[PDB]
Amino acid sequence: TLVKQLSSNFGAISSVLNDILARLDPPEAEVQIDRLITGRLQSLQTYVTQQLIRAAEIRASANLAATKMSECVLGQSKRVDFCGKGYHLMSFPQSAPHGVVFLHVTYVPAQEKNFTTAPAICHDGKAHFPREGVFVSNGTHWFVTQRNFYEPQIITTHNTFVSGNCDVVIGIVNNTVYDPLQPELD
Amino acid sequence: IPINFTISVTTEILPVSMTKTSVDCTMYICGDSTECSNLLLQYGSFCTQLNRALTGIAVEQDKNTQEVFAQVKQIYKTPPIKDFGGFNFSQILPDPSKPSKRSFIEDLLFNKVFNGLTVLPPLLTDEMIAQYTSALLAGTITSGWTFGAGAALQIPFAMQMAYRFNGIGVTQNVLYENQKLIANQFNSAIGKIQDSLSALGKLQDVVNQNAQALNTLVKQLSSNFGAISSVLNDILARLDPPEAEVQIDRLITGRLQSLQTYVTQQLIRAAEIRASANLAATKMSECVLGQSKRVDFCGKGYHLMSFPQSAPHGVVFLHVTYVPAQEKNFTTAPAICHDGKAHFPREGVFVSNGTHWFVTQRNFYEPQIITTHNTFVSGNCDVVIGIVNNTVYDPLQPELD
Amino acid sequence: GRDIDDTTDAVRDPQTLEILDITPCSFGGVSVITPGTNTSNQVAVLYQGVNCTEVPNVFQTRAGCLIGAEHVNNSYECDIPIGAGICASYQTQSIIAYTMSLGAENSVAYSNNSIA
Ligand SMILES: *[C@@H]1O[C@H](CO)[C@@H](O[C@@H]2O[C@H](CO)[C@@H](O)[C@H](O)[C@H]2NC(C)=O)[C@H](O)[C@H]1NC(C)=O
Ligand SMILES: *[C@@H]1O[C@H](CO)[C@@H](O[C@@H]2O[C@H](CO)[C@@H](O)[C@H](O)[C@H]2NC(C)=O)[C@H](O)[C@H]1NC(C)=O
Ligand SMILES: *[C@@H]1O[C@H](CO)[C@@H](O[C@@H]2O[C@H](CO)[C@@H](O)[C@H](O)[C@H]2NC(C)=O)[C@H](O)[C@H]1NC(C)=O
Ligand SMILES: *[C@@H]1O[C@H](CO)[C@@H](O[C@@H]2O[C@H](CO)[C@@H](O)[C@H](O)[C@H]2NC(C)=O)[C@H](O)[C@H]1NC(C)=O
Ligand SMILES: *[C@@H]1O[C@H](CO)[C@@H](O[C@@H]2O[C@H](CO)[C@@H](O)[C@H](O)[C@H]2NC(C)=O)[C@H](O)[C@H]1NC(C)=O
Ligand SMILES: *[C@@H]1O[C@H](CO)[C@@H](O)[C@H](O)[C@H]1NC(C)=O
Ligand SMILES: *[C@@H]1O[C@H](CO)[C@@H](O)[C@H](O)[C@H]1NC(C)=O
Ligand SMILES: *[C@@H]1O[C@H](CO)[C@@H](O)[C@H](O)[C@H]1NC(C)=O
Ligand SMILES: *[C@@H]1O[C@H](CO)[C@@H](O)[C@H](O)[C@H]1NC(C)=O
Ligand SMILES: *[C@@H]1O[C@H](CO)[C@@H](O)[C@H](O)[C@H]1NC(C)=O
Ligand SMILES: *[C@@H]1O[C@H](CO)[C@@H](O)[C@H](O)[C@H]1NC(C)=O
Ligand SMILES: *[C@@H]1O[C@H](CO)[C@@H](O)[C@H](O)[C@H]1NC(C)=O
Ligand SMILES: *[C@@H]1O[C@H](CO)[C@@H](O)[C@H](O)[C@H]1NC(C)=O
Ligand SMILES: *[C@@H]1O[C@H](CO)[C@@H](O)[C@H](O)[C@H]1NC(C)=O
């Protein structure tokens, strides 16, 4: 568009200065040259302003890309949906013409299983809470497992910590803790 | 060490989009005269350039709205049974009574706000945005943060609250032994929010600015710009082309300058709104779909969760936070050495009430007794600057009998 | 009679002494909807923001009636946008105009003692 703005009269008799310098002497060629100058100055100013705005936008995008490169690649990120959908593992940077490309490696759970849970378990009047897992049951027994991958273990005194009595917790069930100390006393 | 705690709901307002307008270029500059159009035709592609810029801005507005709100693919719905462990989300959930599926707050928000100048309807109406917000609320309530990474995983709300406390260094039992208290506090806070709203300067400033700019553009049509009249119909008459051409040229130059100024201001404002929309999208993605640990990013205090609500050309967040209330001055000690072995706290801090010694978590006074499972040994109490003498229970010798 | 815009909107007839109101003729804009010249040649034209009594298949929309395309009762993902929650596509062959669908709908099986 900047190139094509050079073929407009802008109110003159011709769009080429070589046809104004000829066929005319300065005294009345000056006004037409002034008209051309004003038109081309306006075009230049418009182009420069648009370029400045676009450069600001590209600067913002480049800052975002630099932050992504610094955080997703050089370390593991914990900001949700910042380095891809799902839990973040790592990223690999690749170059591109006037740009950068990231290959985010993520982790997504696949298959679910409906379970019946319980906030806590009280053995002998002492409510046991899970240390780091969640209480699940398959229907007949009770297990403790991590949240993000079914790995059922057996309730012991090292997967739970005691606090109070099972009289104020809203949801509570009755079960027994293994307590692996009495079998070895013999 | 704090002894009590309070739950506080905080609101935040962010502009997202602005009105999409398109300016009929040749209708503004010349109206309907053929001579004026022929005389303007010899300047260049200014007209087309302005139209292209003003269409790009309009496209970008819908891109902004779609980026902010369209973050979920499946429209979740809450079950008719409302058993959330005592919490009451009736204020923010949609009600069938209202024709539109807007909540009690999403509607209170909506009640607080020839030339060639045309406006364009938004791509998404105010019903689809409300459906998106309802879906986000249902997903957050019924599945926690799991719906932001894959398929929704149902979980009781109380257990989700317990795990969200666990995420900020407060053990689970604090919730389970106080569930009614937090429920009542949250209900009172969410009531106070609607009481206070019944405020939106950020959402109103953009509307006022756009109206003022459009009005100034309209009013620039009554200036002579050095001619004999401000109406082209009085130039076409009373004059023949040979000397009407100069005055028409003056009018054309003035109106082109006005159009360029308006377009430049609109472009700058659109860039600012784009930045604000990107910030709002980041807040929606991080504070809502998961628990945040960036200090003072989703409200003051420790973050628990947020609930999104829509607003005219904007989005509103209700950050739920956790703030300690009452303090108690205590005397502490870096470590305790029992028999020449310095014991350090596993995850707590050593405190004393004057006569005995206890170990407690930092964010809620819960004094326990020092044992061999709350501490780990290292070296001897000869190099630690601050050390005291005490005994560890070591619950093994009483059971040996 | 004058308005905020400083343009005349009322005039008194110099003969019958009766006042008359003047309003502009609808102009709007013209947009063309195409699925690409590689696939087909049929196009649909959208006369923006005009009650199409004025314009010389018609489907009235809030953004202006769309001609050359049929209206369906179904709802699919938005292919190309029109405005006010309406999108058009080349699925069925002719050009169809429908209401955009947010996505698949599912209800989470939620209860106070169930986890997944
Ligand atoms: C729940 O899981 C437990 C543990 O695997 C199951 O108990 C076992 O069931 C198998 C199948 O008959 C037996 O061979 C084992 O001897 C059982 N072990 C114990 C310790 O009881 C139980 O059957 C499962 N319940 C359901 C409904 O699937
Ligand atoms: C867990 O076990 C305890 C003790 O066996 C139960 O407590 C008793 O429950 C019976 C049920 O009717 C009551 O009549 C008693 O008054 C309770 N207390 C005592 C001291 O016996 C408790 O109910 C069980 N939890 C259940 C079944 O969920
Ligand atoms: C922590 O603060 C809450 C809020 O004041 C206290 O709850 C109050 O308890 C008293 C005594 O039962 C009641 O009369 C008030 O009505 C309660 N207030 C509310 C808002 O429910 C709570 O007691 C405090 N915790 C401690 C350990 O003192
Ligand atoms: C510091 O806390 C300990 C533990 O609660 C207090 O010791 C108890 O004090 C009460 C009050 O007379 C007695 O009934 C208990 O028998 C004490 N228990 C033990 C294990 O000694 C102690 O009094 C507190 N000190 C201060 C200054 O408040
Ligand atoms: C903790 O107890 C030890 C042993 O009882 C103290 O170590 C002795 O402290 C006395 C105090 O005058 C010194 O005279 C001894 O030389 C120290 N060593 C031995 C082997 O007895 C220690 O000072 C106590 N820590 C205190 C009081 O802060
Ligand atoms: C678990 O069983 C319930 C009971 O019918 C059902 O509603 C739910 O969809 C099931 N969940 C899965 C993951 O199978
Ligand atoms: C769970 O909900 C059922 C309703 O089906 C109710 O009978 C039961 O008491 C509830 N239990 C808890 C712990 O909320
Ligand atoms: C929730 O709040 C509403 C509004 O005040 C009230 O009518 C209702 O009883 C409260 N509780 C439940 C369970 O809806
Ligand atoms: C604890 O006691 C000290 C000693 O006077 C006092 O300066 C301080 O303010 C007290 N702190 C609290 C929280 O009461
Ligand atoms: C703490 O400061 C007091 C000054 O009041 C000093 O006597 C004491 O030795 C200091 N102790 C430590 C462990 O810094
Ligand atoms: C003009 O003449 C017509 C009939 O000849 C008459 O009705 C009208 O009142 C007269 N005056 C004006 C101002 O039209
Ligand atoms: C046009 O459509 C055909 C058939 O779908 C496809 O094979 C081709 O790649 C497309 N593009 C061009 C340039 O032909
Ligand atoms: C268009 O004009 C007709 C004239 O009777 C009217 O009935 C109809 O409601 C109008 N439609 C719109 C969208 O303005
Ligand atoms: C679409 O729905 C309307 C009203 O529900 C009905 O009159 C019309 O026949 C339907 N068209 C088709 C193709 O189902």
Numbering used by the authors:
A (entry chain A): 961 to 1146
B (entry chain B): 714 to 826, 855 to 939, 944 to 1146
C (entry chain A): 566 to 621, 641 to 676, 690 to 713
Task: Copy the relevant paper text.
In addition our structures of unbound, uncleaved Alpha spike suggest the trimeric state of the receptor-bound form of the Alpha variant spike might be further stabilised by the substitutions D1118H and A570D on the inter-monomer interfaces, as also recently suggested by Yang et al.. Spikes of both variants have the same mutation, N501Y, in the receptor-binding domains. This substitution confers tighter ACE2 binding, dependent on the common earlier substitution, D614G.
